[PDB]
Every structure is written in structure tokens, then in C-alpha cells.
Point group: C3
Chain length 488, copies 3
């Protein structure tokens, strides 16, 4: 048994996120100039708008013809009058007046354009028609639909390489480039304005490492060196530098803008080494004559070797602490997921834990792929393949993209949806259906009861005494009464 | 709330399998000759068969004695006439004729042997008895039971060390050695034939590394070197080579067949180093006099050190990307599995997440082991220990084997089973019972209803109006009628 | 389909725990003197007790006044008479006699102290009152409440730094320091006695590594060396040693007691290097003049480099075997947990696997925090936020502590609870509610039936024929009978 219930409940705990502890093996630093939109990059680059139209002409009930257009039609232009919106930076609403008619009906039927900016202007959804044989235009010029009230979905703020300038773009679905951020906009037009967007332009050094470029030959089926076969050395060598920044390990070139997300560095070039003035003279002109003194070079190397050794040691220890917790993670999650030990072993089998240390393998084997999820007998839903009752829900299974779980650049877009906001204890779920309906199931077992004997042949059909059969017996008995009506 | 439903559904994604990116730290290559059964190794080594017998003698109803043997008896010989089956390579079916009698009854009762091969011969399951007081032999010589229509279970094709020759064996349950593969066979005999089985015998170089063998002393409680205490050097040293191949890291010996699965190399020996002609002269006769020139040796080493440093850097970065995703994997799977943080911490406790960052520890402690799953009060099934209703299902819990999750050599064998093949949306499961019966539970809650008030004292016993009690009231009332039969 | 059922069930398997395989890169050993309470440290340091009192004076029914104190009051002193309990080492129970009265009532009302030790003395829970207008003292001096019958919860046995001496403390909730172990005690007092507690005091060498301490400057925004800018060397350098022991990687100081759990070493100092007598002369006075001979130093380094290279190789291979099994672990657990790929990618989205290789992302976005789990509309329970029926169960969500999943020092304390002991197949659970009630749900679907047609308008209200309505029809019909009582 041992259902450990709650009396002496402890203090709450939190699993702290991983903090990077880079090894101290770097010896060379460069001079770079970081830039960052990110924080001081709140949202602005172009715009958004929205348009309502409501022109109508109430024909009436005799002249039934009223073919009018009270509709939610977002006429969406682009950066034409944005440099004038930049002088007001708000919602320029056109004619909010309604109920035009006849010749001067160019209020709710005219050009859907923007002239007068208001702070928090909105719509009234004009629909009132009261002019028989005349026109009732109902354009309130809808205003106000922004963001998701917290950031904006479909992208985050980043920079892109543009030879020299850093683009505030990022280019996925909806905007210039295509890039939505903190709070103005959803679509194309004008409502998108400075709220803190700048470029920090710092100056850091970016601890790094170097790599020599030695030409190679491909004689026979091997890879020699094209400097060791002939015995000649290399004049004017070239190196390649790899730098490390926050959670990032990239390759700094001579003069470019290597921007993976949101630092988008560019190099200046100072190169500050800290090994030894005589090991920085050997590893720049590698196999030359030079003037190096051995007595120092064979010293520094010793030093360096020790450091490398120590580095390995730390890694080993860390690797151990990662090789144990994983082994304990496949012994407590292999009891829930059946095909967990039938994925780590390559083959396809199903496990079954009979003992808390002993499991047993049953070979639930494999199936082909390339189908369309509608064929003779099987479909998926959650993980595998057992009975339902045929709603015919094909998906057609189009072609997919790679995601590369380790190196990730993927975000963006809404689907539908509402929020998960605050409180009132009626709102209880977990991860899936099984905690979506945990109260309902408990209610079912408790109230309905497993039903060992209670449901007494009630599951037969839909005619228990049809109610009024008993009622008609009742009426006929009531006549038996009356007593054959007191003896006729 | 926020149940994110589906309107703007994205493109399908796929998690790509891991691609190896070995570090460029190797400097020595050897000359090997790979061999591979694997692909061009389809199935063949010996055989399979199956036998039906049906000799009968219909005594009749008066002479009840009919003790005959229409049975599925697979008489299974071994490699006697296989070299003749290799001249036809098909199912040699014996006498398909039936209904023998009397003296010449040696058709369906005689030696169950194989003579005439047919392409797709099968059985008829002869059972017809029509000869009263005579014999009705019913041997169709059953033919046709092969594989699982996709590969063959119980093994895959590999090679084994046989001094010189590579065995196509692999030796687990059923065959020569014991090794079933692509498609002929299940059991012992003859039906198993060449379908593409060859040995490729390629020639690769297998990037590798070396290790020196220095003798050690055990003075006091330490481990010295038996070359540094006395100050003497080593003449004619010996090295040990470790090579790396596809997902494999093994130790190449002088002249052997080191075959871990399915490449089973063997060495020729060329040794092609790419460090320097003067560092390959120092690391072959280590502490000798030699003729090395310092000016070059202290250069190359510098080079080498840089490379090693760079290697560490890459590893560190990769390790970071593995130390974060794991930390995020124990914060979203610790809400489903209760005893997940009570396994990673050594002790036994149960977690409870009250906040999406805060969890709370309850100490569901430990139990002993060595039981037989039937004792006073607890059993297991899935993970732990709470109420059922006693079917008495002991397992007796025999002794187990180690699997060593990291280094795996384990496969093989069927249990029962059917296939999971194509379509029709009625077939919906996941991983366990909880998606085995997801439609049934939803149907239960919807149709049956939680039952707050509906089940009105119906769960009492099995006698609602016994139906005909109302019916008998009805009959007696019908007599009240007749009207006491119109006033007698 | 393919529900792989069980006919040919294999041998049971066990996932073996991780065994450490440290790399052979160490070259320096120290001389330490380990100590260990741990095994030969069974429990003892001070004590435990418990006290019952039962003095009463039965007034009766007329003189209702009986204000007496039969109570479970554990009067808990501390180490006063423990040095006398160390001469008997058992439960010293006071006066077990009861039923005192009048002036000589100092038996069950007097000082609750300990005088006479008995082997397995217990309580009788005296409550019998029989003396009207006299006193009935009922003190049995309760004895016997120890441990949890297996170890003692709230701590394990460890040592703490006390300048020189090793404390058997560990200091969490209940005892000297505060530290409970194998079996005597729960609370403060006397019952806690030697059962095998000693200190082994071994002598090991603890393979280790060194680190040089080079001063650094902070000119501009870089980190130079304060020995390379001026070109001067360092006299009398100082090193820092990092040692590795069982699953532990710590830093050994000059003369201290660095005790992380339960070895609590302290250093003696011998330093036994195995590199070369001339590389141990270069790396002690680093940039000095010395007397080193180059011809040997440039040899040993080569050797060392090879070793380091080989070490990296092994790590790489191991890292590969950890980078694959993880990738296969997020492709079979992402089908159960919805927000598993919406945690590894940083952003918040919900996955949906339509194909066994293809998944689809729906953006279930984020919520704020800092709440008290009772606000307008949402609460948690297991993982997320959907409907319940309002029990008002606020938690108030106090502040939490960090746990640092990798480096763990955290244990201790009970809550409630019972044991999970032996057998009888009625006891079946898994990890949560979903296997807490797996038999009940199956019983529900089977017995109650999904209810397509059976529940025939029975879910209306609580009045089916109110039973006796049919009964009263019956009585009135019985009068119709009697036959209007045989024609009046």
C-alpha cells in the first residue's frame, strides 16, 4: 500500500535552471562590437490597421431590395501615410459619422482612408436602418485590435544581416520583413510606433579559440598533409577563430555580420593572447625558423598540458552526474510508457514491469509508413492503434520539415484560443484528457457505482411501464369503481 | 483554462535522428579489410519444413474403433537432403495423394519425407472419411509457413568469429548456429535458400588512436612506473590501438577477427600517421637516444595542443546543450510520474506540484524485495501497490539477467500476436490502457451521465415490479371486470 | 492493432545501475586518512523517551467533579541522566504501579522521571476508575516507540566539521546536532545507545590533479597575466589540488576537514607523482632557471599528449551514446506529455502527434505567476488548468528553496503513512490516480455498460412509481374486490 498522505508537509522547492560554467581553457580574446535590439527593442518598425464599412439603403418590406454591406472588411494598405502617422502615433480614424444618403453618401461608402488620430478610439458597430426609400450608411471605422495583450505572437525581435546595417526584421509571416513584437500590431498598415526600440552597440571581447588551416592530399584512400609529404613549411598562414558567447558557440570571420539571433556581432580585431610571448611567436609562423628560445617554450607547454588535463577531469565528473540521472530516468518512466525500452534498443518490443527491478519484454513489432491515416484497419490519435467507432477523420499526412532538437531556430504563430489566468479552484487539469476529466471520472465511480447488482435488468430497452400503462390500469380501475357506477 | 484548439494548424514537423560528428583529433590510420553480410546477406544458410499426416480407417458406428491421426505434426529433420533442395530451391512436397487402404496404405502412413518441389504448394487439410471397414488416409503434406512476411524474428543477420572464416551464425534459438533472417524459415530442415547472401569484403582505414603499455609497480599503496623508479628506458615497446567506426569504438589487435556485430574487420597493418616525421620517431622508441631535432618537435607539440584545446571547447558546448534539455525534461515529466524526484535523489519520496515552478515532497518510503508477488498484502501490476479484488495471479519471480542500457546486444523472439496495418479511423490507441479505452470512457461520461439525481434508488436489488406483478394486478382487474362477469 | 499478448514470455531483465569508469589521466596522488561513520556508525549519540500520566479522582455522579488527566503527554527531558542510562542501555520505566489516593498520591501525579530499565516494557493505558470519593491514579509510564522499524527517517548518519573532531551530527530537525539513525529514537531524551557506532579511520591516496595560481590584471576590459606583462617569473608558487573519490570531485586544502557527506578526509601530504622526475621539476618552479634537460622533457610531453588525445576519444564515444538515447527519449515521451516540446524549445506550445514520426504544434501559450492559487478563474492540481466544482482549497503559495538537481544534499522527515509490504494480488497500483483506479474503471465500463439504449429515460427525477403508488392501486383493487364485498 503506502499511499503517503499529507500531515507534516515540507517547504516548497524549485528546480533552478541550468547555469553555464564554461571551462577556463581559453587564451585568446578578440575585439568585437555587440549590438542588441532584444531588450531596448520594444516593437516598432511599420504598422497595422483595421476598417469597418456599413453603407446601407433601407428599401423596406415592399421594395425588398436592400443589398448593403455592413461587414468587417479590414482594408489593409501599407507604408504610404506612415510618415504622417509618425507625427501623431495613434489610431487615425476617418469619418465616424454615419447615416449618409443620396448624392452626399460619400461618408460610409467613400475611400476607406485615415485622417484623424484618436487615443483609444473604437467601433460602435452601426447597424441601425431607419430611412425607408433612403440610405443609412453605418461606417464607424472600426479601431482597436492589438497584439495578444502580452508581447505579440508570430515572432520575437531580432536582427538580420544586411551587409552593414542590422535589420530589425526576422521575416516569418505578417509584417515588414515579417516580424511582430511587443504591442501595436497584428496585420499590415500603420499602427506600429516607437516604444523603446534602439540598438545598444556595446563592446565586448568574446573569449575564443583558433584553428589552423592545413591543406590535405587524398592519395590512395587516406588523408595526408600537403606540407608533410614534401617536407616544406607554409608561408603566410591563415587561421579560423571560434568564439563563445551566452549559450552560443559561433565562428567569427574576418569582416562580416555573423548573426544568429540578437547579438549580431561584427569584428574589429585586436587579438589579445595570454599564453606566452614566445608561444604566440611559434603558433603564428608554425614551421618557420623564427627566434624562439626552447627553454621557455618547453616550460609553457607543460603548464598548458596541466590545464588541459584538469579540464578533462571536470568534464568527466560532470558527465558522470549526467550518466546516472539518465539511467534512473529510464527506470521510472519505462513503467508508464510501454514502448520506451522498445525505442532505446532499436528494435520494437513492449515492456512489462512485474517487479520494481525486473521487467519483461513482449515483442509488439513494427508497421510501415507513408500512409494517409485512412486505409483498411488502423489509426493513431495519441500513440498507437486500437478500437474506435469510425468518424472518418483523414488528415492526408503531407510532407514535413526537420527541427534538429539540439540546435533550434523555430517559433511563431497563433491557432485559436483563450487565456489561463488566475484562480477559483474549479479549474484543475494536468497534461491531457486524463486530468482533463479527473473530477468527472471520480464522480462517475462514486455516484454511479460500479454496479454489481443495482442495475437490475434495466438495460433492456426503452419501455419501462411506458409510465401511463400503469396510468391506464389506474383509469380502468377507477371505473371498476364508480362500482360499476353504484350498481348501474 | 487555455485549451489551445485547432484553427491555424502549422506544417508537420519531424525530429531528425542524431547524426554523428566525430572530433578531428585522430592522427593515425590503419589498413583493414571490412566484411559485411548485413545488406547483401539476405537470409540463406540451411532450412525449414513442415509435415501433415492424416492416415485414417473409418470403423463406422457399429465398430466404433477409429483411432486415427489427422494431426498437425511437423516432422522436422535437418541437413540431410539439403544439397538436393539446393538444386531446386523450393518446397519439396511428398505424396499429396490420399485415401490409401489395406496393404498399399504406405502413402499417408509411410515415411514423411520430401521428394518433389513445387512453387507455392499448400495443404488441403484432408479429413474426409468415407470408407466403412476400410482406410481413408488424409495426408496432404502441409506446405507453407514462412517468416512473418517481413524479415524473420528471433534474430538478424550477423557474423561470428571462427578463427579465419566469418560465420553467418549468431546463435540464439532456432537454426544453424541459431539465426533466422529475411524470408524462408521458422524451424529446422530444408526451406532456406540463397536470396542475395554474400560478403562484400571492402577495404577501409578506420581512424584510430594508440595507447602505450608501461609496466607499473605496486609499492606501498600506490602505483609507480617500473621504468621511472629505476631510471631505465624501455627497449622494443608495444602499443595498443583503438579504432572508431560507425557508432562503434573498438580495440584492433595484431591479427584477429574482432567482430562485434556485422563488420568483423581483421587487420592488415600499414599505419599511416600524419603528425610529423619527427614526432613519429619520438613516440615509437619513447625514452631512447634517437636523432630527433628539438626545434621541430617543440613546434608540432604546440600545434597539437591547440587542436586538443579546440576539441575540448566543442565538447563543452555540446555538453551544455545536453545539460539544459535534461533539466527541462525533469520539470515537465515530474508532474506525471509521482516518484520521479524520489528516484533521482536516491531516497524514496513522492512529489506534488502545487505551482508550475514549486513542487512539494511527501515521503512515500521504500519496501523490501526478493518476494514472489504473493504474500499477505500488496502486488504490483503497473508501478505500485493499491487495491484490487484477488484473482490469485502469482508470477514466482525467477532470477534475471543484466542488460547494460548503454552497450546493448539483445534482440529476438516472438510471443503471439497480429499486425497494425493500415487505416479506417476506428482504431485509435496510445501507449497503455488509458488510451486503449479513451473512447469508451468518454462515451461513459457522456451517455451514462455522472448521475447526480437520475439514478433514483434504482441501486437497491433485482426486483423492480418483477414486471408481471403489475401484469397480475392487471389480470385480477380484468376479472373485477368482465363486472364480476356482468353481475354473475 | 497489434496488441502483443503473452504466450512465449522471455526471461526477466534488470537495468543495472551505472558503474563509474574514471579516465586514466591522473598522475599525482596524495596521502589522506579517510574516516567513516556510515556503515560502522549504526545509530548512537544521545536519546529518546516518552511519558504517560493517568492520575484521577472519581467524584461520581452526584459530585460530578472529576477533572483528571489520563493523557498521552510525552514529558521529554534531555541529557541529564543519560550517563546512567549508558550503564543499562534500555527503557528505564518509573512506577508502573497505579491507583494512588489521598496524601500518598505521589505515584501517578509525582515527578515523571526514570529509574528502572526494563527490556521490552510497554504501556497498559490504565483508565479504570473505581474509587468513589477517592483517587484512581492511572500512570503506566508509557514505553516503546522507536524508529520506523527500518532505519530512522528525518536523517542519515554523517560527520560534520568540528575543527579537529568529526561530529556524528548532521543537524536537521530532532536530536543532538539534530540527527536520527538506525533504531532507537524519535524525540529528545535517553533511549539511544551504541549498536556498532565507530570511526574506521582508513588510509587511502585519492587520485587527484593540480592547478596553478597565476595572478591576473584587469587592464582595459581584458584579463592579462601579472607575470607576462612585466616579463618576470614567480618565486615560491602555490598550487591547488582537486581530488576525486567515490562519485565525488572535491578540493583538498592544506590542513582542514573538507567533509561533504561521510568520508571527511583531512590531508597528511606525501605527493607521489608518476610523470617524470624532470617534469616534476619544471612544474614546481615554473619559469625558473632550474637544471632540466630538454631531451627528456620534450619526450615526456609527447607521451602525455597522446594520453590526453585518447581520453578525449573515449569521452566522445560515450557522449555519442548519450546524445542518441536522449533523442529517442523525446520521441516516445512527447506523445504522452503534451507540453514536452513546448518546454525544450523555450516557447510555450502544445504538440500533437498525427504520425509516428510527424507531430504538429498548437500554441498553448503562457500565464503569469506570483498568485495564491485562488483568484478569478484557474487552478492547478496536477499540471494545468481546466474545470472542477469549487471546493475552495487555497494553498497561499509561500516562498521556496533551490534544490540544484545536479549537486544534491537534501533528505529527511515523515508526513504520515503506512507500509507497502508483501502480497495478496488485490493490491495493484502504478504511479498516480490512473492506476490507483484501473480495476474500478474497467469494472465500470464492463458492468455498467456505455449505455447506448439501456438507461431508458430513468435519468429524470426521484419518483419511479414511488413504489407504493402501485401498492395503493393494489389496495383499491383488492376492495373492488372483496366484490364490493360480495354485493354489499
Amino acid at each position: 500500500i503506502e499511499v503517503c498522505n499529507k500531515a507534516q508537509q515540507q517547504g516548497p522547492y524549485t528546480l533552478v535552471d541550468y547555469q553555464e560554467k564554461p571551462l577556463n581553457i581559453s587564451r585568446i580574446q578578440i575585439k568585437v562590437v555587440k549590438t542588441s535590439v532584444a531588450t531596448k527593442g520594444l516593437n516598432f518598425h511599420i504598422g497595422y490597421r483595421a476598417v469597418w464599412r456599413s453603407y446601407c439603403y433601407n428599401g423596406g418590406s415592399l421594395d425588398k431590395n436592400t443589398g448593403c454591406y455592413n461587414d468587417l472588411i479590414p482594408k489593409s494598405p501599407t507604408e504610404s501615410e506612415l510618415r504622417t502617422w509618425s507625427k501623431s502615433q495613434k489610431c487615425c480614424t476617418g469619418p465616424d459619422a454615419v447615416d449618409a444618403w443620396g448624392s452626399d453618401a460619400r461618408i460610409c461608402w467613400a475611400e476607406w482612408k485615415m485622417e484623424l488620430c484618436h487615443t483609444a478610439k473604437e467601433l460602435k458597430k452601426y447597424s441601425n436602418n431607419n430611412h425607408f426609400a433612403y440610405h443609412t450608411c453605418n461606417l464607424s471605422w472600426r479601431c482597436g485590435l492589438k497584439s495578444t495583450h502580452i508581447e505579440v505572437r508570430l515572432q520575437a525581435s531580432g536582427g538580420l544581416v544586411s551587409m552593414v546595417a542590422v535589420m530589425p526584421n526576422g521575416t516569418l509571416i505578417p509584417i515588414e520583413g515579417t516580424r511582430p513584437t511587443y504591442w501595436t500590431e497584428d496585420s499590415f498598415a500603420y499602427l506600429y510606433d516607437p516604444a523603446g526600440t534602439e540598438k545598444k552597440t556595446e563592446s565586448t571581447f568574446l573569449w575564443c579559440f583558433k584553428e589552423h588551416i592545413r591543406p590535405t592530399t587524398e592519395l590512395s584512400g587516406a588523408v595526408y598533409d600537403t606540407h608533410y609529404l614534401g617536407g616544406t613549411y607554409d608561408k603566410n598562414p591563415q587561421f579560423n577563430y571560434y568564439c563563445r558567447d551566452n549559450g552560443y558557440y559561433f565562428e567569427l570571420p574576418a569582416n562580416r555580420l555573423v548573426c544568429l539571433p540578437t547579438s549580431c556581432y561584427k569584428r574589429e580585431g585586436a587579438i589579445v593572447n595570454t599564453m606566452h610571448p614566445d608561444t604566440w611567436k611559434v603558433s603564428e609562423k608554425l614551421h618557420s625558423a623564427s627566434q624562439f628560445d626552447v627553454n621557455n617554450v618547453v616550460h609553457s607547454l607543460v603548464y598548458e598540458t596541466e590545464g588541459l588535463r584538469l579540464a578533462l577531469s571536470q568534464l568527466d565528473h560532470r558527465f558522470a552526474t549526467l550518466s546516472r540521472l539518465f539511467n534512473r530516468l529510464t527506470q521510472s518512466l519505462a513503467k508508464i510508457d510501454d514502448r520506451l525500452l522498445g525505442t532505446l534498443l532499436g528494435q520494437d518490443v513492449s515492456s512489462k514491469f512485474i517487479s520494481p527491478t525486473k521487467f519483461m519484454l513482449s515483442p509488439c513489432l513494427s508497421t510501415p509508413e507513408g500512409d494517409s491515416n485512412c486505409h483498411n484497419h488502423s489509426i493513431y490519435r495519441d500513440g498507437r492503434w486500437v478500437h474506435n467507432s469510425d468518424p472518418t477523420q483523414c488528415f492526408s499526412l503531407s510532407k514535413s520539415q526537420p527541427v534538429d532538437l539540439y540546435s533550434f531556430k523555430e517559433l511563431w504563430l497563433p491557432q485559436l484560443l483563450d487565456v489561463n489566468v488566475e484562480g477559483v479552484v474549479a479549474d484543475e487539469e494536468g497534461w491531457s484528457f486524463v486530468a482533463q476529466s479527473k473530477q468527472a471520472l471520480i464522480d462517475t465511480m462514486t455516484y454511479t457505482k460500479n454496479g454489481g447488482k443495482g442495475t437490475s435488468l434495466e438495460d433492456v430497452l426503452g419501455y419501462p411501464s411506458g409510465w401511463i400503462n400503469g396510468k391506464l390500469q389506474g383509469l380502468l380501475l377507477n371505473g371498476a369503481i364508480s362500482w360499476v357506477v353504484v350498481i348501474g
